[PDB]
Enzyme design. Structure first.
Site, PDB file in Angstrom:
ATOM      1  N   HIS B 233      -7.739 -17.595   2.605  1.00 35.11           N
ATOM      2  CA  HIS B 233      -6.948 -17.129   3.729  1.00 35.11           C
ATOM      3  C   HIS B 233      -7.502 -15.863   4.400  1.00 35.11           C
ATOM      4  N   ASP B 267      -3.174 -30.251  -2.620  1.00 39.16           N
ATOM      5  CA  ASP B 267      -2.208 -30.301  -1.523  1.00 39.16           C
ATOM      6  C   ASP B 267      -2.789 -30.724  -0.180  1.00 39.16           C
ATOM      7  N   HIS B 268      -4.082 -31.020  -0.192  1.00 34.33           N
ATOM      8  CA  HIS B 268      -4.834 -31.442   0.981  1.00 34.33           C
ATOM      9  C   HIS B 268      -6.260 -31.587   0.496  1.00 34.33           C
ATOM     10  N   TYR B 334       1.675 -31.391   5.805  1.00 35.36           N
ATOM     11  CA  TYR B 334       2.807 -31.753   4.959  1.00 35.36           C
ATOM     12  C   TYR B 334       3.866 -32.524   5.729  1.00 35.36           C
ATOM     13  N   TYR B 467      -4.830 -46.938  -3.916  1.00 33.01           N
ATOM     14  CA  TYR B 467      -4.985 -46.811  -5.364  1.00 33.01           C
ATOM     15  C   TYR B 467      -5.229 -45.390  -5.864  1.00 33.01           C
TER      16      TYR B 467
HETATM   17  C1  HEC Z   1      -8.291 -22.803  -0.708  1.00 32.91           C
HETATM   18  C2  HEC Z   1      -8.862 -23.855  -1.642  1.00 32.91           C
HETATM   19  C3  HEC Z   1      -6.799 -22.589  -0.815  1.00 32.91           C
HETATM   20  C4  HEC Z   1      -6.134 -21.987  -1.832  1.00 32.91           C
HETATM   21  C5  HEC Z   1      -6.705 -21.543  -3.176  1.00 32.91           C
HETATM   22  C6  HEC Z   1      -4.764 -21.826  -1.383  1.00 32.91           C
HETATM   23  N1  HEC Z   1      -4.590 -22.335  -0.102  1.00 32.91           N
HETATM   24 FE1  HEC Z   1      -2.922 -22.275   1.039  1.00 32.91          FE
HETATM   25  N2  HEC Z   1      -3.828 -23.454   2.295  1.00 32.91           N
HETATM   26  C7  HEC Z   1      -5.148 -23.933   2.276  1.00 32.91           C
HETATM   27  C8  HEC Z   1      -5.441 -24.701   3.460  1.00 32.91           C
HETATM   28  C9  HEC Z   1      -6.744 -25.346   3.873  1.00 32.91           C
HETATM   29  C10 HEC Z   1      -4.300 -24.714   4.166  1.00 32.91           C
HETATM   30  C11 HEC Z   1      -4.057 -25.477   5.435  1.00 32.91           C
HETATM   31  C12 HEC Z   1      -3.435 -26.812   5.072  1.00 32.91           C
HETATM   32  C13 HEC Z   1      -3.092 -27.625   6.289  1.00 32.91           C
HETATM   33  O1  HEC Z   1      -3.738 -28.678   6.495  1.00 32.91           O
HETATM   34  O2  HEC Z   1      -2.183 -27.200   7.044  1.00 32.91           O
HETATM   35  C14 HEC Z   1      -3.289 -23.967   3.441  1.00 32.91           C
HETATM   36  C15 HEC Z   1      -1.981 -23.740   3.865  1.00 32.91           C
HETATM   37  C16 HEC Z   1      -1.123 -22.787   3.365  1.00 32.91           C
HETATM   38  C17 HEC Z   1       0.085 -22.290   4.055  1.00 32.91           C
HETATM   39  C18 HEC Z   1       0.896 -23.092   5.114  1.00 32.91           C
HETATM   40  C19 HEC Z   1       0.904 -22.763   6.613  1.00 32.91           C
HETATM   41  C20 HEC Z   1       1.713 -21.512   6.963  1.00 32.91           C
HETATM   42  O3  HEC Z   1       2.809 -21.330   6.398  1.00 32.91           O
HETATM   43  O4  HEC Z   1       1.264 -20.713   7.811  1.00 32.91           O
HETATM   44  C21 HEC Z   1       0.442 -21.127   3.378  1.00 32.91           C
HETATM   45  C22 HEC Z   1       1.669 -20.251   3.605  1.00 32.91           C
HETATM   46  C23 HEC Z   1      -0.518 -20.951   2.299  1.00 32.91           C
HETATM   47  N3  HEC Z   1      -1.450 -21.997   2.293  1.00 32.91           N
HETATM   48  C24 HEC Z   1      -0.480 -19.880   1.321  1.00 32.91           C
HETATM   49  C25 HEC Z   1      -1.098 -20.046   0.051  1.00 32.91           C
HETATM   50  C26 HEC Z   1      -0.814 -19.270  -1.131  1.00 32.91           C
HETATM   51  C27 HEC Z   1       0.001 -17.983  -1.113  1.00 32.91           C
HETATM   52  C28 HEC Z   1      -1.540 -19.794  -2.173  1.00 32.91           C
HETATM   53  C29 HEC Z   1      -1.612 -19.361  -3.663  1.00 32.91           C
HETATM   54  C30 HEC Z   1      -0.435 -18.684  -4.371  1.00 32.91           C
HETATM   55  C31 HEC Z   1      -2.312 -20.873  -1.563  1.00 32.91           C
HETATM   56  N4  HEC Z   1      -2.042 -21.013  -0.213  1.00 32.91           N
HETATM   57  C32 HEC Z   1      -3.588 -21.346  -2.143  1.00 32.91           C
HETATM   58  C33 HEC Z   1      -6.080 -23.667   1.294  1.00 32.91           C
HETATM   59  C34 HEC Z   1      -5.844 -22.867   0.210  1.00 32.91           C
HETATM   60  C1  HEC Z   2     -11.553 -50.054  -1.680  1.00 29.50           C
HETATM   61  C2  HEC Z   2     -11.565 -48.594  -2.093  1.00 29.50           C
HETATM   62  C3  HEC Z   2     -10.512 -50.909  -2.366  1.00 29.50           C
HETATM   63  C4  HEC Z   2      -9.172 -50.881  -2.159  1.00 29.50           C
HETATM   64  C5  HEC Z   2      -8.384 -49.876  -1.325  1.00 29.50           C
HETATM   65  C6  HEC Z   2      -8.628 -52.019  -2.877  1.00 29.50           C
HETATM   66  N1  HEC Z   2      -9.628 -52.731  -3.526  1.00 29.50           N
HETATM   67 FE1  HEC Z   2      -9.443 -54.451  -4.574  1.00 29.50          FE
HETATM   68  N2  HEC Z   2     -11.294 -54.224  -5.130  1.00 29.50           N
HETATM   69  C7  HEC Z   2     -12.229 -53.250  -4.744  1.00 29.50           C
HETATM   70  C8  HEC Z   2     -13.524 -53.514  -5.319  1.00 29.50           C
HETATM   71  C9  HEC Z   2     -14.820 -52.759  -5.122  1.00 29.50           C
HETATM   72  C10 HEC Z   2     -13.362 -54.613  -6.071  1.00 29.50           C
HETATM   73  C11 HEC Z   2     -14.397 -55.231  -6.963  1.00 29.50           C
HETATM   74  C12 HEC Z   2     -14.208 -54.676  -8.362  1.00 29.50           C
HETATM   75  C13 HEC Z   2     -15.163 -55.289  -9.348  1.00 29.50           C
HETATM   76  O1  HEC Z   2     -16.051 -54.557  -9.841  1.00 29.50           O
HETATM   77  O2  HEC Z   2     -15.028 -56.508  -9.617  1.00 29.50           O
HETATM   78  C14 HEC Z   2     -11.979 -55.045  -5.981  1.00 29.50           C
HETATM   79  C15 HEC Z   2     -11.431 -56.163  -6.606  1.00 29.50           C
HETATM   80  C16 HEC Z   2     -10.236 -56.764  -6.285  1.00 29.50           C
HETATM   81  C17 HEC Z   2      -9.850 -58.140  -6.664  1.00 29.50           C
HETATM   82  C18 HEC Z   2     -10.407 -58.909  -7.896  1.00 29.50           C
HETATM   83  C19 HEC Z   2     -11.384 -60.088  -7.798  1.00 29.50           C
HETATM   84  C20 HEC Z   2     -10.738 -61.383  -7.300  1.00 29.50           C
HETATM   85  O3  HEC Z   2      -9.609 -61.694  -7.732  1.00 29.50           O
HETATM   86  O4  HEC Z   2     -11.356 -62.100  -6.487  1.00 29.50           O
HETATM   87  C21 HEC Z   2      -8.754 -58.447  -5.863  1.00 29.50           C
HETATM   88  C22 HEC Z   2      -7.893 -59.705  -5.897  1.00 29.50           C
HETATM   89  C23 HEC Z   2      -8.483 -57.275  -5.045  1.00 29.50           C
HETATM   90  N3  HEC Z   2      -9.385 -56.246  -5.343  1.00 29.50           N
HETATM   91  C24 HEC Z   2      -7.388 -57.159  -4.099  1.00 29.50           C
HETATM   92  C25 HEC Z   2      -6.887 -55.879  -3.736  1.00 29.50           C
HETATM   93  C26 HEC Z   2      -5.596 -55.616  -3.150  1.00 29.50           C
HETATM   94  C27 HEC Z   2      -4.692 -56.707  -2.590  1.00 29.50           C
HETATM   95  C28 HEC Z   2      -5.445 -54.255  -3.036  1.00 29.50           C
HETATM   96  C29 HEC Z   2      -4.257 -53.420  -2.485  1.00 29.50           C
HETATM   97  C30 HEC Z   2      -2.812 -53.920  -2.550  1.00 29.50           C
HETATM   98  C31 HEC Z   2      -6.712 -53.714  -3.521  1.00 29.50           C
HETATM   99  N4  HEC Z   2      -7.582 -54.707  -3.936  1.00 29.50           N
HETATM  100  C32 HEC Z   2      -7.210 -52.387  -3.095  1.00 29.50           C
HETATM  101  C33 HEC Z   2     -11.981 -52.203  -3.880  1.00 29.50           C
HETATM  102  C34 HEC Z   2     -10.782 -51.992  -3.258  1.00 29.50           C
HETATM  103  C1  HEM Z   3     -14.680 -26.084   9.246  1.00 27.58           C
HETATM  104  C2  HEM Z   3     -15.411 -25.912  10.579  1.00 27.58           C
HETATM  105  C3  HEM Z   3     -13.108 -25.993   9.298  1.00 27.58           C
HETATM  106  C4  HEM Z   3     -12.221 -26.841   9.965  1.00 27.58           C
HETATM  107  C5  HEM Z   3     -12.509 -28.109  10.789  1.00 27.58           C
HETATM  108  C6  HEM Z   3     -10.890 -26.347   9.703  1.00 27.58           C
HETATM  109  C7  HEM Z   3      -9.731 -26.963  10.168  1.00 27.58           C
HETATM  110  C8  HEM Z   3      -8.459 -26.465  10.030  1.00 27.58           C
HETATM  111  C9  HEM Z   3      -7.322 -26.958  10.784  1.00 27.58           C
HETATM  112  C10 HEM Z   3      -7.261 -28.177  11.694  1.00 27.58           C
HETATM  113  C11 HEM Z   3      -6.331 -26.060  10.550  1.00 27.58           C
HETATM  114  C12 HEM Z   3      -5.019 -25.933  11.293  1.00 27.58           C
HETATM  115  C13 HEM Z   3      -3.790 -25.981  10.409  1.00 27.58           C
HETATM  116  C14 HEM Z   3      -3.140 -27.349  10.365  1.00 27.58           C
HETATM  117  O1  HEM Z   3      -3.250 -28.023   9.325  1.00 27.58           O
HETATM  118  O2  HEM Z   3      -2.500 -27.739  11.367  1.00 27.58           O
HETATM  119  C15 HEM Z   3      -6.825 -25.076   9.604  1.00 27.58           C
HETATM  120  C16 HEM Z   3      -6.041 -24.119   8.954  1.00 27.58           C
HETATM  121  C17 HEM Z   3      -6.465 -23.352   7.875  1.00 27.58           C
HETATM  122  N1  HEM Z   3      -7.795 -23.334   7.474  1.00 27.58           N
HETATM  123 FE1  HEM Z   3      -9.336 -24.218   8.257  1.00 27.58          FE
HETATM  124  N2  HEM Z   3     -10.911 -25.204   8.914  1.00 27.58           N
HETATM  125  C18 HEM Z   3     -12.263 -24.967   8.680  1.00 27.58           C
HETATM  126  C19 HEM Z   3     -12.746 -23.889   7.988  1.00 27.58           C
HETATM  127  C20 HEM Z   3     -11.957 -22.995   7.286  1.00 27.58           C
HETATM  128  C21 HEM Z   3     -12.481 -22.158   6.208  1.00 27.58           C
HETATM  129  C22 HEM Z   3     -13.956 -21.923   5.921  1.00 27.58           C
HETATM  130  C23 HEM Z   3     -11.404 -21.745   5.433  1.00 27.58           C
HETATM  131  C24 HEM Z   3     -11.333 -20.892   4.120  1.00 27.58           C
HETATM  132  C25 HEM Z   3     -11.712 -19.414   4.133  1.00 27.58           C
HETATM  133  C26 HEM Z   3     -10.239 -22.308   6.128  1.00 27.58           C
HETATM  134  C27 HEM Z   3      -8.952 -22.032   5.773  1.00 27.58           C
HETATM  135  C28 HEM Z   3      -7.804 -22.507   6.370  1.00 27.58           C
HETATM  136  C29 HEM Z   3      -6.490 -22.056   6.033  1.00 27.58           C
HETATM  137  C30 HEM Z   3      -6.075 -21.288   4.803  1.00 27.58           C
HETATM  138  C31 HEM Z   3      -5.665 -22.471   6.994  1.00 27.58           C
HETATM  139  C32 HEM Z   3      -4.340 -21.730   7.134  1.00 27.58           C
HETATM  140  C33 HEM Z   3      -3.103 -22.251   7.838  1.00 27.58           C
HETATM  141  C34 HEM Z   3      -1.955 -21.267   7.763  1.00 27.58           C
HETATM  142  O3  HEM Z   3      -1.569 -20.913   6.631  1.00 27.58           O
HETATM  143  O4  HEM Z   3      -1.452 -20.833   8.821  1.00 27.58           O
HETATM  144  N3  HEM Z   3     -10.560 -23.089   7.215  1.00 27.58           N
HETATM  145  N4  HEM Z   3      -8.151 -25.316   9.317  1.00 27.58           N
END
Ligand code: HEC
Ligand code: HEC
Ligand code: HEM
Ligand code: HEC
Ligand code: HEM
Ligand code: HEM
Ligand code: HEM
Ligand code: HEM
Ligand code: HEM
Ligand code: HEM
Ligand code: HEM
Ligand code: HEM
Lengths: 499, 499, 499
Positions: B233, B267-268, B334, B467
């Protein structure tokens, strides 16, 4: 005197540094190396296990015997010709290698970065002369199949069925003394002040000895499953792990991917933590602008590398780079081990912390390096404390005979293993209520989650010690353990009421 | 007038677009930026937490003070010389960079793709003139250590112990106004129609403010653990996150790996979903045929890029590419958040969906793009509904005081946090039966599994919502919650029978 | 006669190898291909499900209808011009491709590695002549949009709203007969000796038929969730999966990343196991020294490749490389399937094991290859046995009506699915106590953990069958199942005491 090898190693071997000849130095190392009193062989639990087919490859000096299939008596050139058809890729990979291309190393330009190899070639030749493997006025023509698979500088024919061997660490050591001795010096350098770990461990020099000494490994009937552990513990027996077979590239062993297959997973996820950190990501994004052919010593300058890697950090001590990777080990991966945390403030640890700052300071400011390493420590203690709280609970449940099936259905572990609470064997053996769900929980909390919490901290991966790994999983374990303790507590209440 | 910045930003700052000078525009932004009433400082829960050693780096404007260790008064050339030895890699990385190589940018050929930088250089110089940092008939000689670490275009000596600073967002903004303002405009552009989220969030402009405002972060005693959240952050305080320290490469921030360390995990798992999708895999397989040096605007043409990336998709709005990444946020990661799902059919959302089709249509057919985005929505609602079913159950268990230890062993959360059911604090704090196993289950179902289900859907990763992630894990949670509810229900029956 | 196609395929189609013309051969394949009695259409459970918007892309031959949005009648050159603006990246990617650059293929030097393509071009032209698509004294000018999206070698105008189609497997087959027939021959070659699996499965030729025949897929109301399974089962309908859309690169499909999106996850983690193995890691470290443009046949020689990959191993049979990937399937991923383990020692299996040694022996010694494959088998049987022990328990709990909510709250599954114990539907559908926690546990033990144990073993990833995956997770499942069985056993005791 092989400058990079610690005095301690010389002393232990009984060698006079400025008097020991390469032949003598080599003879000593191999002495201890092939000695069962030091880790060689099948170990103390040998009567309990037997080797499987693939075992002749994991531990040659103990199990390997030549393939009697083909009755052939061959010479240097025969090995290559026949194998051109028999093992196509094996011959090509070798031909394209420095072992097959010694001339290049000799005609190297002084201004070329890979020039240091020319010196390494001279050294090797002198090792061989001292050992009578090479004549005084003789050069090493090449390092071919017959050399590694029968005898170094072998002239005459070799009998395939009675002469073929698998090259072990000492086999490379006949030429690569400097590297062999540096790795063997780990037995001498990794010695803990309070016996927290076995002398010379954890390390690569005694990793196989550590594997066979794991009771579970020796007692569990599933030899095929158990063997997957042997594969991560072969460094002691063979040197083809970081720089792989037949091509034996040093550029390859310098890349993070080389350590990845072993240094990953649940009880330690070094690979996953590193790759996710900035250091690691930059290593992925810039791997193409880096010259991996340049030795570690010149990596940050001539190599162009501007991000640390597994080898750069772990093979560097005080400016020197060696094959000994023990000199800076403080937490030995598992923080819960007795007297580890407790030892974290010893002058021993302090002095190793200083060594680590010396490593971070090639790039960051000391103030910055010290700011993070401090967090690494206090952060590991916070995860440790959480484990101890949950452990305190389940342990008493044991003392009180209240674990599920403890009094009734808790079969004894396989010999020579003795019964107990929270044993490693419980991670690989289960029968009935041994181990009990709550026991396995408190166990994996320490061996997996707490371990990964540390790894994440040590390898600058934020989510690796917070949400994704470490704290997150541990928070769940504690909650579920608690939630179970109370349920069992209310169940017993109703029990007494009825009787 | 900085074309890429939204009117709204100008209005909010009280600036007349066609009248505001760069100096004025900059002064306004920094005003709001350093103002505690807008997110600066320690926050509302400041009395509860204290900064740790590494905190001076995470939030300089609040904690950083010069290192009194070395008493040195240096000049521009001294910084480099001394540091050549003190921080080797830091000097090299800088020298090899555009900041150290401004002349190249000037002598750029018009037909060269990286020519646009020459214009960006002129712009910067004009920003500095307006701010009196650069003379009217003067060029920017270079961007060295003394410039970023003390004063822009600093001539005279700097006192190491009293003058050194850590470059924050506004420091880069003195030259990079266009980028700074675009990012700050996020406070003005990400405003939800029903207060589902705090104005100007989620975003990079207020990510640190969002972190310190997280009660748990401020209340939990484990500051080292809690700090791993601060590291994800920091974007608000410093601009070295996507394009890292000292080398500050724009090519680097364009690569998916740059977002990976933060945008991954439970969480993402944006990183994991993307890398596994076709888009992502193609990005791995073709990263070598792509010119990452070319700005996003020319990527799909001159860059040769034929697969989307994190930046290409997220930094593009309506053909324009900016540093503001909020303009297209519908689900804010979320799905369970109140009024989010409910808002998914608003003209607000509809208009953003149109913006996303505009992004997919550079390659796919609109019919195709609309076919998938529709599935993304209905698919997220199906995972949401499953959560609500399980939640409905555990919630009543709360209303009825029947959660394990709810009446007895459920310690209160740390101040200033107030007790409740299913709170975020329960993901980072646990004590006794708070939270209760079933509570943590219904919690992680939404915060982790449901969240990841969406991410998988949004980033075309089939197994990521089926899955492997999403549905699979959620199906288990629902089953186990159900299975527990019934057991507790039968236990109570027998309870009454006895009493 | 198309040398690479199995006799069996010719026989089944009723074709005389040395008499069947390309037109005849093609006509036969498509006959069976578009025939519902062989897997075409909506399947046997068609009355239960309906297609969603994106379904017209997953199964064109059943759902696709031209986009009536734009009323345009265009010609070959119009498609390109209009789309230059409409779908920018789609036109560029195509122009930069061999389909758009046929002349290069013709003027290829004989000593060039990519020369074999020139022959492949001649062949195609002959296929078209035989089918009347190309004149006898006529060359294939190019393979543009109008060819694939309306008609092969289409001259005149095409009506956008009534003529546009989505290219299915047979569409490519009009030119790529050799490839189409090789893949279709899978229906004929993957036939098990004891009906362990449906004839011609598992395979790519019947993957969509296998998906729609999955009861759960047809019965579950969550069509968006269920569709994520369709995406991994499209190979049957379209050929753009390994070598992706518009660029259709063969070099791309040879890289491991191409199989990754589908071949990863919980029930099989081929991607994860491989990438972690030495083979895989070396593939990452050496991908830059390898020429992926060289066909599989010359990869280990002219390509420089010295590590196996997904395609190299799986597309090779006895020295030949084909698009049929069934010929060597022994364990079909899931070891728990009836009569699979039991069949592992059949001459059928033995003969396929020999085929696999033939693959490993291009590099390793046979003794070595046989040493590991043996461990792979016995190791899979050890993980299988563990499952059966736990299964034996939970199964009786079913027979005795003692599963949680079995008698009371266990709602019936959706039609046409019938109730039962441990059904696949339980992995994607849950309601109340169906499935029951212990049931889901014993289920995922086999479908996920046991499956992954095998994959790890088959893809030389030590931790993948030991700690991290397989054994580790399975050990936990067994323990928790046991721990629950005993608790329920003691609960019932107290039950009777009260009544
Ligand atoms: C990096 C791997 C992270 C760690 C460790 C923590 N957070 Fe996080 N957080 C991360 C991302 C990439 C995002 C954005 C997710 C999205 O797609 O929106 C977030 C989001 C939050 C938010 C929510 C938005 C907001 O309220 O403004 C908050 C408040 C937040 N994160 C705080 C938070 C705290 C305090 C954590 C540890 C106790 C935590 N995050 C860990 C990525 C990462
Ligand atoms: C991609 C990430 C997959 C998703 C999502 C689902 N399946 Fe899958 N399935 C996958 C692979 C690579 C394979 C082959 C595995 C092996 O090593 O044999 C399979 C296999 C099945 C089979 C079994 C073989 C057969 O009966 O002919 C079936 C029937 C099948 N998968 C169906 C299925 C359904 C309906 C799913 C979601 C409700 C499901 N798969 C998810 C890869 C992937
Ligand atoms: C890499 C170029 C990169 C992208 C792409 C990216 C995207 C992204 C989006 C779309 C958001 C908006 C929030 C939402 O989900 O709507 C967002 C928010 C956060 N990001 Fe990010 N982000 C990229 C890079 C970085 C890097 C390198 C970091 C970590 C130091 C980072 C972190 C975060 C965090 C945390 C949020 C915070 C949201 C909040 O709490 O208000 N992003 N990012
Ligand atoms: C590769 C993926 C491994 C498998 C499979 C097994 N082990 Fe392991 N082990 C591995 C590593 C990288 C390490 C070092 C961890 C660290 O950071 O310190 C270890 C460590 C051990 C040790 C501890 C040190 C010692 O006592 O000398 C032992 C005894 C050990 N491992 C044995 C062992 C056994 C017997 C296993 C299966 C039954 C097992 N390990 C699996 C990596 C890998
Ligand atoms: C034992 C199986 C063995 C190993 C391991 C090994 C490794 C090794 C490496 C990593 C290199 C570097 C290759 C490169 O260009 O990056 C290398 C080089 C040389 N070796 Fe070797 N080598 C093994 C065995 C042997 C044996 C038995 C001899 C002596 C006959 C030998 C000799 C050499 C020489 C000389 C070189 C070239 C100079 C150098 O790079 O050091 N090796 N080897
Ligand atoms: C890659 C160049 C690589 C590095 C780096 C590395 C590091 C490492 C350390 C620091 C230790 C010391 C033990 C400790 O934790 O204090 C150590 C120990 C072991 N390693 Fe390692 N290792 C690298 C490579 C390899 C390879 C390729 C393997 C797998 C064949 C491997 C294995 C192990 C094992 C096992 C240990 C054993 C410790 C013991 O039981 O005594 N390492 N490694
Ligand atoms: C086994 C004891 C073993 C030997 C012997 C060995 C040899 C070897 C040589 C000869 C070199 C020098 C090659 C050159 O020309 O640079 C060399 C270099 C590296 N090795 Fe090694 N090596 C042995 C074992 C191992 C193991 C188990 C690892 C991985 C933990 C490993 C790693 C490396 C690395 C890294 C290098 C480069 C070091 C540098 O300073 O550049 N080796 N090895
Ligand atoms: C603040 C720490 C800061 C950041 C961040 C930063 C980034 C940045 C990037 C990404 C580039 C591109 C480099 C490349 O070739 O890809 C870049 C370029 C220039 N910068 Fe910068 N920069 C930071 C700080 C400063 C400061 C304080 C100044 C003004 C003295 C400045 C100036 C420039 C100039 C000029 C360029 C070159 C032209 C261009 O590519 O825009 N930067 N910076
Ligand atoms: C912090 C507010 C910040 C500044 C300032 C900054 C500057 C900067 C510059 C000067 C450039 C232009 C360099 C060039 O010559 O092309 C630039 C380019 C990119 N940045 Fe940046 N940047 C700041 C912050 C961030 C953050 C947190 C991210 C990641 C989410 C990020 C990303 C990028 C990307 C991508 C580019 C290239 C954009 C393009 O159109 O090519 N920046 N940044
Ligand atoms: C159907 C959508 C289809 C696919 C799939 C496809 C694939 C394919 C590949 C992988 C190549 C190789 C490109 C490279 O350089 O690596 C390729 C090459 C040729 N194709 Fe094709 N192709 C599809 C459809 C069609 C159709 C309808 C025709 C006939 C009009 C056709 C023809 C060709 C020819 C000729 C070549 C070049 C020679 C060769 O590499 O085989 N393709 N195609
Ligand atoms: C990449 C070139 C690739 C390989 C290799 C590959 C292998 C593979 C095998 C060996 C099978 C046979 C079935 C068995 O386990 O015995 C198989 C089956 C399926 N595959 Fe596959 N596959 C590769 C690529 C692709 C791609 C790109 C996808 C996803 C669109 C994919 C999918 C599947 C599926 C599903 C099956 C279905 C089996 C069935 O249900 O009958 N494969 N694959
Ligand atoms: C669908 C039935 C389908 C067709 C048709 C097809 C065509 C195709 C062509 C024409 C080539 C040759 C191109 C060249 O010039 O080398 C080719 C090559 C490869 N393909 Fe393919 N292909 C179809 C489907 C699939 C699928 C689903 C996969 C992945 C499992 C796949 C993979 C490959 C690979 C690998 C190659 C190279 C093979 C080699 O010997 O080098 N194809 N395909």
């Amino acid at each position: 005197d092989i400058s990079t090898v610690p005095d301690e190693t010389y002393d232990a071997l009984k060698l006079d540094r400025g008097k020991a000849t390469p032949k003598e130095t080599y003879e000593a190392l191999v002495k201890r190396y092939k000695d069962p009193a030091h880790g060689a062989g099948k170990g103390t639990m040998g009567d309990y296990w037997e080797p499987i087919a693939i075992s002749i490859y994991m531990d040659p000096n103990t199990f390997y015997k030549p393939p009697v299939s083909p009755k052939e008596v061959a010479e240097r050139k025969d090995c290559v010709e026949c194998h051109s058809d028999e093992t196509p890729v094996w011959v090509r990979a070798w031909k394209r290698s420095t072992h097959a291309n010694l001339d290049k190393i000799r005609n190297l330009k002084s201004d070329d970065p890979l020039y240091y190899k020319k010196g390494k070639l001279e050294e090797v030749e002198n090792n061989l002369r001292s050992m009578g493997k090479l004549g005084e006025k003789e050069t090493l023509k090449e390092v071919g199949c017959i050399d590694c698979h029968v005898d170094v500088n072998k002239k005459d024919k070799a009998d395939h069925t009675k002469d073929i061997r698998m090259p072990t660490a000492d086999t490379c050591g006949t030429c690569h003394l400097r590297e062999f001795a540096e790795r063997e010096s780990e037995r001498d350098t990794m010695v803990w002040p309070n016996g927290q770990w076995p002398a010379g461990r954890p390390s690569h020099a005694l990793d196989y000895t550590a594997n066979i000494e794991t009771t579970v490994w020796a007692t569990m009937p599933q030899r095929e499953v158990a063997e997957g552990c042997t594969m991560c513990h072969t460094n002691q027996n063979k040197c083809d792990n970081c720089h792989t077979r037949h091509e034996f590239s040093a550029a390859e062993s310098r890349k993070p991917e080389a350590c990845a297959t072993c240094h990953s997973g649940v009880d330690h996820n070094n690979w996953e933590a590193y790759t996710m950190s900035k250091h690691g990501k930059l290593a992925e994004m810039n791997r193409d602008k880096w010259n991996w052919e340049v030795r570690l010593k010149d990596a940050f300058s001539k190599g162009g590398q501007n991000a640390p890697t597994c080898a750069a950090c772990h093979m560097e001590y005080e400016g020197e780079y060696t094959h000994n990777i023990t000199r800076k080990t403080r937490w030995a991966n598992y923080p819960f081990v007795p007297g580890i945390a407790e030892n974290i403030t010893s002058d021993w640890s302090e002095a190793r912390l200083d060594s680590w700052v010396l490593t971070c300071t090639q790039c960051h400011s000391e103030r910055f390096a010290r700011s993070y390493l401090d967090l690494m420590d206090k952060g590991t203690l916070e995860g440790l404390a959480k484990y101890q709280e949950a452990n305190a609970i389940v342990h008493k449940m044991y003392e009180d005979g209240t674990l599920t099936g403890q009094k009734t259905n808790r079969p004894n572990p396989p010999e020579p293993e003795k019964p107990g609470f929270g044993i490693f064997t419980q991670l690989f053996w289960s029968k009935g209520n041994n181990p009990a769900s709550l026991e396995l929980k408190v166990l994996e909390m320490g061996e997996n989650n707490l371990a990964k919490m540390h790894v994440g901290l040590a390898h600058v991966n934020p989510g690796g010690w917070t949400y994704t790994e470490g704290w997150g999983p541990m928070n769940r374990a504690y909650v579920e353990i608690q939630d179970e303790y109370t349920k069992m507590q209310e169940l017993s209440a109703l029990q007494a009421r009825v009787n």
